[PDB]
Amino acid sequence: HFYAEYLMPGLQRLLDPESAHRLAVRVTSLGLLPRATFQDSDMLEVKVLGHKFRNPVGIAAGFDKNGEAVDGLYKLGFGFVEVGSVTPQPQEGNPRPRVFRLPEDQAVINRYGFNSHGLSVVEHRLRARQQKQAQLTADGLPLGINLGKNKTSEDAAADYAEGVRTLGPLADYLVVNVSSPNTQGKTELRHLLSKVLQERDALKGTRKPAVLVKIAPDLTAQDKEDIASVARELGIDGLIVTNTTVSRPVGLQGALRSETGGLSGKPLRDLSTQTIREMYALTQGRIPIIGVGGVSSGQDALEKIQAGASLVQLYTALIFLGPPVVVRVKRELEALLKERGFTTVTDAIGADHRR
């Protein structure tokens, strides 16, 4: 409660979004935040992507862009952390201002345009902690790395390749982020993905990261069939559904609603869940999905899980509710699984399809 209508709305008044984000990352890294004490139950454990996840709630890409706060994030209760997106070379991103809060809608619009410290900086930081991560991973706390491309780049495959070569040895999973709204066709995707998988395969007697593709919520019905077709044809390990949306739904109260960019938070929630449900159907329940978009409660997580997600992520909820939201989600999720007749979270995955 202290976070929810004392600290967050107040920070909102005081701090511009970028300043607030930067502060959040630093406070999280430094461990100033009180630690989560909620204990995950066996009921929340998920095994997927070649790893065990102690709980199914992860932090989505975009919070820890540069891998500065990974340990602190696990301490807040996240089951898994995704770093990035990381671009090969450092870049500024778009002109400020570039992130807008719509508190009325519990939503954010962003056009960051991939401000990243770049691969070498993030490699150095992650390497220094690689041993610690190996222990965390073993304890059910995996690490994902999300790869982006520079604004310049004509050659996407080359940018992705630097990323896979550089960070793939540090990753439990890798994500190709082809969905930023702020920076194709089957064949073109197929080529790129094959090149990425080929870079992954070449890795170094690392035993090797799973490769996922992160998609937009704004796709055509054929693209969804296409993406499913490729994933199955290429043996892509997973899908992350979804990134932010370019739409503005009816009823936004926020002044900044007209701003160009990707919308996240509650207004995205149902569109994202719908997108998961299709993808599970098209892929026959055979390809794991990490569901993201507007999760801020246990029910929100459960809906995504029932729709077909094996895991879920959140980011935007933190902006409005603070760190307690991670525990709220897990606590609510456990309570709902018990009420609703599931012995474990795993039993819920794809339940919508079952009926």
Ligand X SMILES: Cc1cc2nc3c(=O)[nH]c(=O)nc-3n(C[C@H](O)[C@H](O)[C@H](O)COP(=O)(O)O)c2cc1C
Ligand Y SMILES: O=C(O)c1cc(=O)[nH]c(=O)[nH]1
Annotated binding site for FMN: 61-65, 85, 146, 177, 214, 242, 265, 294, 315-316
Q: Cβ distance 53 to 311 under 8 Å?
A: yes
Q: Which of residues 66-105 bind ligand 2V6 (CB under 6 A)?
A: 99, 101
CA distances in angstroms from 113 to 91, 182, 295, listed in the order given: 9, 5, 23
Using CB under 6 A as the binding rule, whether residue 244 contacts ligand Y is answered as yes
Closest residue to ligand X, Cβ-based?
A: 62
What are the beta bridge partners of residue 47? 52
DSSP assignment of 89-153 equals S-B--SPSP-EEEETTTTEEEE-----B--HHHHHHHHHHTHHHHHHHHHTT--EEEEE---SS-
Size of the site for ligand X (CB under 6 A): 26
21 touching ligand 2V6, by CB under 6 A: yes
Reply yes or no: is the peptide bond before residue 323 cis, omega within 30 of 0.
no
Separation CA 210–CA 143 (nearest Å): 11
Q: Could you tell me the smallest distance in angstroms from the CB atom of residue 115 to ligand X? A: 9
Active site residue 180: yes
DSSP 40: P
Binding annotation for substrate: 65, 110-114, 177-182, 243-244
Which residue type is seen at 71? D
Q: Which does 294 bind (CB under 5 to 8 A by kind): ligand X, ligand 2V6, ligand Y, none?
A: ligand X
Listed ranges 155-163, 176-184, 215-223, 292-300: which one lies at the site for ligand Y (CB under 6 A): 176-184
Query: With respect to ligand 2V6, which residue has the nearer C-beta, 179 or 316?
Result: 316
- The active-site residue, picked from 19, 41, 116, 180, is 180
- When binding is defined by CB under 6 A, the residue of 28, 55, 133, 243 that contacts ligand Y is 243
Mask of contacts with ligand 2V6, 27-46, x by CB under 6 A? x-----x-------------
Number of other residues whose CB lies within 10 A of the CB of residue 97: 12
Q: For 168, phi and psi rounded to 5 degrees?
A: -60, -35
Task: For residue 51, state whether it binds ligand 2V6 (rule: CB under 6 A).
Answer: no
| Least separation in angstroms between CB 258 and ligand 2V6 | 17
Determine, following the binding rule CB under 6 A, whether residue 118 of this chain makes contact with ligand Y.
no
Residue 163 makes CB contacts below 8 A (sequence gap 6+) with: 86, 88, 119, 145, 147, 148, 174
* Residue 292 near which of ligand Y, ligand X, ligand 2V6, none (CB within 5-8 Å, type-dependent): ligand X
**For ligand Y, which stretch binds (CB under 6 A), given 174-182, 197-205, 309-317, 347-355?**
174-182
305-330 b/e with 16+ CB inside 10 Å = b? bbbbbbbbbbbbbbbbbbbbbbebbb
What are the residues binding ligand Y (CB under 6 A)?
A: 85, 110-114, 177, 179-180, 182, 243-244, 262
